[PDB]
Design a protein. Sequence first.
Length: 479
Amino acid sequence: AMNLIPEDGLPPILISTYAVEEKPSQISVMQQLEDPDPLVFVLNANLLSMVKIVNYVNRKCWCFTTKGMHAVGQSEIVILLQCLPDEKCLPKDIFNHFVQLYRDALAGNVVSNLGHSFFSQSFLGSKEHGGFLYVTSTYQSLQDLVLPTPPYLFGILIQKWETPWAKVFPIRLMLRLGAEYRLYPCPLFSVRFRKPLFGETGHTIMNLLADFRNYQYTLPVVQGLVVDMEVRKTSIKIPSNRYNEMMKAMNKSNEHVLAGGACFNEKADSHLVCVQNDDGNYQTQAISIHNQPRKVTGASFFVFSGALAKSSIVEDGVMVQITAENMDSLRQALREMKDFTIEHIHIQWVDDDKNVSKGVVSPIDGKSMETITNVKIFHEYKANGKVIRWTEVFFLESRLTEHVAKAFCLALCPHLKLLKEDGMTKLGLRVTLDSDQVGYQAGSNGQPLPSQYMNDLDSALVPVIHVVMELIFYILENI
């Protein structure tokens, strides 16, 4: 029911008439793969997986994608598994992993950019296959790939020895993979049976900033915070919508030390890499977008010490020593949300960090959601064999939202079967509240909902309603 992958054989195949073919022939599936459109597999009634052989960055790959993760508050997943020389069967373990990820999302545990998944049993034929590191594509090629609707993440297969880095400092692993394959910032494909890029964590400077034994804590991270290194200039760029995240990090620090992890700096032409040698000792290296002389280089962490301004690079991060007075001055400016200047050292409050992914549109009218704030929902109604779920809300700029959500779902419950059969699976409700006006709009597939449901929607929403807000709903199959 929740898992249609059998003990022996492939999961059912989906055919456009839609029809389902249970236990498909592995010979026919392999034949079809060696001849535009991907094969569609049914992992469950709400989760599909597309498979296609692609020539990606001069490597023959298995392109595995998902459809159904959005309905459970998770980004769709893409795995580009490099082919083993003359691979006979389809690598089924990917399907098992996709189902596990679906179960996790249903329980409230989702994977995001630089997130991870670890394995309990052996995976893809080796016990040294530790998990996946999820990335959002930045500069990597997407050349003739049949991709899901955004948001989607690329799952990169990682070794058991790289697992402490994915948990504690995933940006280091991401960038180290990029250095290894000569791709900026990291490859989007997965390679089985490769040698681990990290061994025992040893005497890394990270021991001082994170917990490798028990993984109780790590570096405080501020989403969108980047470190720019230039000739005689070091800058920490904090997004203006992240004041509270910065304040929480400042209160979780010493009076003499201000440390933090950094995000991937998209605007940089290069990024610092930490390489571990065969002896277990570390080195500082760097990777570049064009291999042109480095102008703006990103760093993976920053440390400010009020014990001296003087700066250094330690592994893949920046270490700055300032006077105790300059530390009090810096801490004061940050509390006032002001910029601070100290070779030059800058702490600048920059443009808001976009929560929403690129290419995300409204199901109502196709308006872009890229510059709109997003709140995922983990807290559904069943009717006519179907399920209606409220997965998220966008604040175009909690008590009312929850009431608006229930009223919308209840009004549509007698109609869930008719909506699904007619192609209306992803639905949206936009509520407007102004001093003068107070109104609502509903839709699916970039069109209004059929007129026959509007009387039912009015009678349920009007009492509740009588600030722009857009709620997302999904109609699923009851499992």
